[PDB]
Each structure stands twice: as C-alpha cells, then as structure tokens.
Amino acid sequence: EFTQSVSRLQSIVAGLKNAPSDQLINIFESCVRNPVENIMKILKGIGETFCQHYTQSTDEQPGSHIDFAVNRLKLAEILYYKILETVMVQETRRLHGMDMSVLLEQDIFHRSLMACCLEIVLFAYSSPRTFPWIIEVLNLQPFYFYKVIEVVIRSEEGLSRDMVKHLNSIEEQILESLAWSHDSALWEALQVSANKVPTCEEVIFRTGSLALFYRKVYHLASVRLRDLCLKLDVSNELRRKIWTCFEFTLVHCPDLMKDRHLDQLLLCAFYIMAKVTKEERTFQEIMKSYRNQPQANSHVYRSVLLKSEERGDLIKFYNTIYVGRVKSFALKYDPLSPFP
Template sequence: MRGEESSDSESGRMEESSVRRSLETLCQELNMDEQTAAEAMDNFTAIWNTYTLEGEVVHWLACALYAACRKGSTPTVGKGLMEGNCVSLTRILRCAKLSLIQFFSKMRKWADMSNLSQDFRLRMDRLERNFEVSTVIFRKFEPIFRDMFVNPQGCEAPRQPRSRKHRRLPCHISDVFKFCWTLFVYTKGNFRMIGDDLVNSYHLLLCCLDLVFGNALLCANRKELINPAFRGLPPTFLADGCVPQSELPPCVLEKLCELHDGLVVEAKGIKQHYFKPYIQKLFQKQILKGNETLLTEMLDPQNFIENNKAVNREYEEYVLTVGDFDERVFLGADADEEIGTPRKFVQERAASQAAAQNQQVEKCGSLAPSTPLTGRVYLKEKDLLVTPVSSATQSVSRLQSMVAGLRTAPSENLLQNFKSCSRDPTESILARVKTLGRTFKEHYTNDSEDTPGSHIDFAENRWKLAEILYYKVLENVLVQETKRLQGRDMSVLLEQDIFHCSLMACCLEVVLFSYSSQRTFPWIIKVFKLAPFYFFKVIEVFIRSEEGLSRDMVKHLNSVEEQVLESRAWTSDSALWSSLEVAGNKVPTVEEVSRNCNTG
C-alpha cells in the first residue's frame, strides 16, 4: 500500500509540474506579470484538486488566467487606473489555441467551480451577447460592402514604398474594407448601450458604410473602388464617373436601408445623435484627419495611412482596458478557427437570442415550406429569406406601422369616451401615464443586475411607442366593452389603477420584445411593481384588442402567460391567494392535494 501511495504522490507531483510548465509557457508568451500568474496557478490548483477537468489542461489554464487578469487594475499615465492588467482575452485565447465559443462554454463551468462573483458572470454574459451580435453583423457587413464597393477578396494590395520621398499610393479596397469594420467596432465600443443591441448595432454599421462610401466617392474620384452596379450611386457618377469635389458627400443611408433590411428613421436617429457627433469628436482629437467640416478626405493618400493606424491604435487600447474581445478577429484568415464554427453558432445561438421573435422561422430556415428544393440543407446562407437582422428590423417595422399616424395622447374619440363617464377619468389617466413614463425611463437608463443602462434617447423612443400603443389599445378596449355591456358606465373600469398599469406594461413588453431587448418579462412588472397574476389577466384583453400584432408578438405574450401559469402565479406572495379568498373559494392544502392524488 505504501508503495502505491508513494507512486500516486509522485505521479501527482509530475502532473503538477507539467501544469506549472504549461502555465509558465503561456505566461511568457503573454508577458504576464508574476502576481497574476501566481493567482491563476493557485486558483487552478484548487479547482484541479476538487473537480475532474475534461479536455486540454491549457484551456482551463486560460480560464484561470482570464479570471485573474480581470480582477486587478493597472495604473496608467493621465488616465488613472485601468480595469484589468492590459492583457486581452484575444491574446490569451490565441496563445492557448482556444476558440471563443469553446472559451464561453468552459468559462461558464469555471465560474461555477470557482464561485466567481455575480459581477464577473454579468461581464461574461455581456461579452458573449456582444460577440453574438457582432457575429451576425459581420455576416451582413461583407455582402453589403461588396454591393457598394468592388470585391476586396482576391485582390492584393500594392506595397507601400519604403522611402518617404516617394508619393504615397492610394488606399487599396482591402484596406478600405478593414478600415470600415475597425471604425465600426471602435465606435460601437464607445456606446455601451449599442454594443449588445442588434438593431442599433446594425444601423450604426450602415452609418459607417455611408460615411466611408461618401469619402470614397470624393477621394480624388477613386472610381476603381466603387461598384458601378450599386443602386445608390449619384446621377453624376453614373453619367461621367466623377463627383465634384466641392459637393457635400452624398448620403446613401436611405438606399442602404431600402436594399438591406434597414429602418430609415432608426438609422437616421443613430447617425444624428451618436455616429456623426462621435466622428466629429475623432476629427477634433486628430485621431481622424481630413476635412473636419464635411467629414471627408479620410481616404485621401495623405491621410489614410495615419487614419488607419490611429483607429487601430485607439481600438487596441479599448480592447486592452474595456472590451476584452478584439472584433477585428473577423477580418483574419483564421477567423473560423479563432471563433470556432461561427456559422453554426450564429444559427443556433445568435439567431435565437438576438432575434428571438423569429425562432419558428429560423428552425425551417426560410419562409418557404421545407421541401427537397427549399430545405435549409440545399440553400446557401445568402439564399435564405430570413436572417436575424431582417427578422429584428421587420419586427420593429411592424411595430411602427401599428402606431403610424397616432399621437402620444388620447384621440378625440377616446376623450369623448372619458367625458361620457359619470366620473371623467382624463386627468387621473394622464397623470398616471406621466408617472409610469418617469419610472420606466429611470430604470431603463440605469444599470440593472443583468443589463447595462441605456441612453435616454433610446428610453424616450421606446416610451413614445408604448404610450401611443397604450392609448390605441385602451380605446379599442372601451369600444369592445361598451358593446358587450350595452353602453353601461365605464367609470369603474377606468378607475382601476392595476388595469392601467398592467395595460401599459403589456405595451412596453411588446415594444421591448420588438427591439430584441434583453429587458423582457419579468423586467417590466418588477419596474412597475406589478403582481404577475394581474399582468396575466390583461394579456388576453390586449391581444383581443390589437389586431396589428404580429404572430411572433402574440407567441411571445403567450409564452409570458405560460410563465405565469407555470410558476409565477403560485409564489407565496402571489395576489392569486387573496383573490381566491375574496371570491370565497377554499384553497386546498398540500395534504389535501396529496391525499386526493394518492386515492386517485
């Protein structure tokens, strides 16, 4: 027995020695500081001695290193303390030969085994969500770019002359492709509320493409960069292949929305309130060089190399200190390996989370019935009619059409209905809506347990749509109830605070769902402090009163009903119990239920 114990002990020491060598090799490649390396080794050893770790040891070491890296902070000149130790997740994964998708899977297990903090877990959730959105967006970026510009693939860029005396060569199309994507991910990273939002991120991408396209048209008439078949070309270009230098850069945002599933109002809002002011700021800081007034000349030979270097440098700093995941990985030749089967991942995860409202269509892959000719197996990605982006934007478009032409106020007909009541509820209804609006916007713009706060502009937009929908549905409810009750006084219904709060919550739930928000049920009833039981009672009324709801919206509300019926209505503090008591119904005890089941 002693001999066996000695052998096991020696084997354990050899294994630990091997693990330490693997960690040392990894840390040397990353130029990791000793403190972080020691903490990672201590944490790894504790987990290794407690759990069975399947797969390659170096992959688990990468998880331990990442967790240790993210705990500390690094002092910097002029910027105080930076989060982390300036070693990016991308570098860790490259050195450990671990794909992003494998990392997310292993990191979730590591967080459980290590009992990592809730803050760290939320950080991982946001990082994974951001990655999913970026994966979907990049798959849209490539075909849109090829639609606007000549195909960057298969063209080698000419080498820049080493001597500074030589005139700089014009930028190549492959450089423009990479510059446009890097500018997009850098800009997106500076708007935290946009990064994990599919609809907003997509419209930000269209803004970037619009800016770069305008610069290309005015860049000494670089005709060879432009796809002559692009349907957004200005008439002057089609006539003689040139655009006067004195002209403002042409805006093709509307055309891009028309051709590629965008929403003009949303895209223009992103451009006006976020993108354009931010690009102006980059010019003011000399990160971008060119015509600061027109936001042009970025691609001109005298500016492009510096602009490209500056944007990449700034983005690298962002990745090291805040972003973790370097989204330029999509541009690399080894993107598939580094990300880890991205196409399958997008279909199975990004499509379900970033465009949840399209789950049923995603299963069959097409709006057409699944047959040997239309089945997903036989179609290329570009041939599918529905994508996560088109699904999300179509859902928002449907919502906007439901409220088109209506105001954020009761209609004249609704006001007349109010006045016909024995007690006019107009004043109390308007006051309640105002209070609910303040509550919603306050919570929507503040960080919650699992989502970062959004910008007030987005909160205002979501509230505006919900408010219009609320008055529309309320009017429809009154019309239906008046017919059903044969003209009886509606005062009692209109004075019920719970009814109005539940109806507004239902409207907001539909709006948030349409925008693929992470703040879906039960977020809104927590914000309004509504009992799930009361919210449940309004859903059927809402669906019956609004004919414009899409099939996906109805399915989502039905899933909320199921959640309430399955669990939320039966909690100890549920309003259901008091409602049963008021109704005079005797609630059976657990013993009675068990006895009946046994005798049956």
C-alpha cells in the same frame, strides 16, 4: 431595412400620437367621472419609473441611454392610447350607451395595459430587458397583470403572429411560476375565498379572479399533460388517473406550489400515478421527453425549492416534500377527475 417586428410596429402606430384621440376624448367626457387626468398621472408615473430603471445599471442589467428610454416610452404610450380606444369602443356598455366611469377608473387595468405596451415594444426591439423585467420595475402583481394579455391580443389585430406568440408565452410564465410566489396576490385571493381552491370541474363547466386564474392554469397543465402522455402513449384512461393526482395537490396541497413551478408538480404527479398503476413506473425517461416542451428548462428539474435552506433537484424535492404530502392519496389506487 427594419426587422419585421419593428416594421410591423411602425405600421401600427403610423399617424397616431401619444395623446388620446378625439374619439377617445369624447368617450372620456361622456363618463360621469372623467378618467383622463388620472390616466395621465399613471402614464407619467410609469414613464418616470421606467426611465429611472432603464438608465440605471445593475449586476444583471447594464443601464442604457435616456434617449432610447424616451423613444421606447413614447412608442408604448402611442400603443396604449390606440389599444385603450379600441377596447372602450368595443365595450358592451359603450354599444348600449351606458356610463363607463367604473370600467375606466380601475388603476390596475391602466397600469397593466401600459406595462404590456412597454413589453410589446421591448420585445419588438429584442430588448435585453426580458420579462418579467417590466412588471417588476413597475410593481405589478403577475396575478393581476396576466388578465390584460388576452385583452391586448383581441383588441389589436395588427400584432404579428410572433408578437402574439410572445404575449401568450409570458402569460404561461405567470401561470406556471410567477403568480405562485409567496408575495403574490393569489394567496390573498385564496384567503378571502376561505382557502377553497377551485377544482377542475368547477371552473371548466364561481367566475371570480380565482376561478378565471385556475381555469387558465388547468387548461395549461392539461395541454402539458397530453403532450407528455404522447411520449409513452399510455392510455386515455390513465391520463385521467394522473390528472387526478395533480388536481389533488393543487386543491388539497396548494402550499406546495408556493415559490415553485407548475411543471415540477405535474412531473412529480406523473411518476407516482404510474408506479401505483397497471401502466407502471415510467422513470425520468419522460424528463428527456419533457425537454421537448417549449417552456422546459434545466432549472425546472435541476433546481427545486426544498425549504426556504438550500435548493435541490426534482427527485430530492419529490422524496423529501412530495411523498409526505401526496402518499396517502396516491396509495389508495392500488374517483377520477374529468380531463379537459
């Protein structure tokens, strides 16, 4: 009589507990610096903050009972200790019998794993507290957080396809918008890199936080270009020409992404390289064809940041902000970047 996702969650945590197992404890104690007490501080901190936000109402989200909060939290903790053990056991240093103290002392990894466990639980129960509610509450940078998602998916095989689909979609949210906000640690990472934005060829062939991020971004945008180039079949020659203008705005106009959506720049790219090329001026016709994509929503092309200071639509964003920046690159097409 339980839902499939809730039943699946039962089978996963069955017989386990919200404390580290004996194997995990052995792995903690083999470290020169034993993480166990710091790991407990973090879960206790996250736990208190979670319950506080869970039980306190806002305009958007009504607060709920503390009994349910503890239930959700206890369940997430159980997942955390199961997944952490699996992660540590399968680690290369573990198999080679090397000290893991450095790996286990990174706070951002433990905070992210615990938040992702909370998100799995909330999703299983079809919580009204919708991502990114959990990382907002816990003060987690999207730019740091998303990295844990791949780890979770590969480290827990008991996750249903639906759980896995959801985790992939919240990763896409981070890549398309959330990691690009003005307060994001992304801009800090770009800054220490001397504002050098990795090109497609460079990360698709580096390997820092920046490169791994842009690798994901470039992969996501290419998939969302391909499908849209299956709308008007275009040609695989032009799908490269359009991928070039989009890469140009990412690398040489990174500010245009700030507080914006990846698809806004990809669509704006589309219309322009069409109009300057033999295959030409495919109109907002592709916007209706953009609606077919899973992540497509009205607010994307209806509501676009201009300056902030009001907020206009995609075509106003384009002619105000975009052409000014992208014209002189695009006009020259009266090189080509490789398409993944």
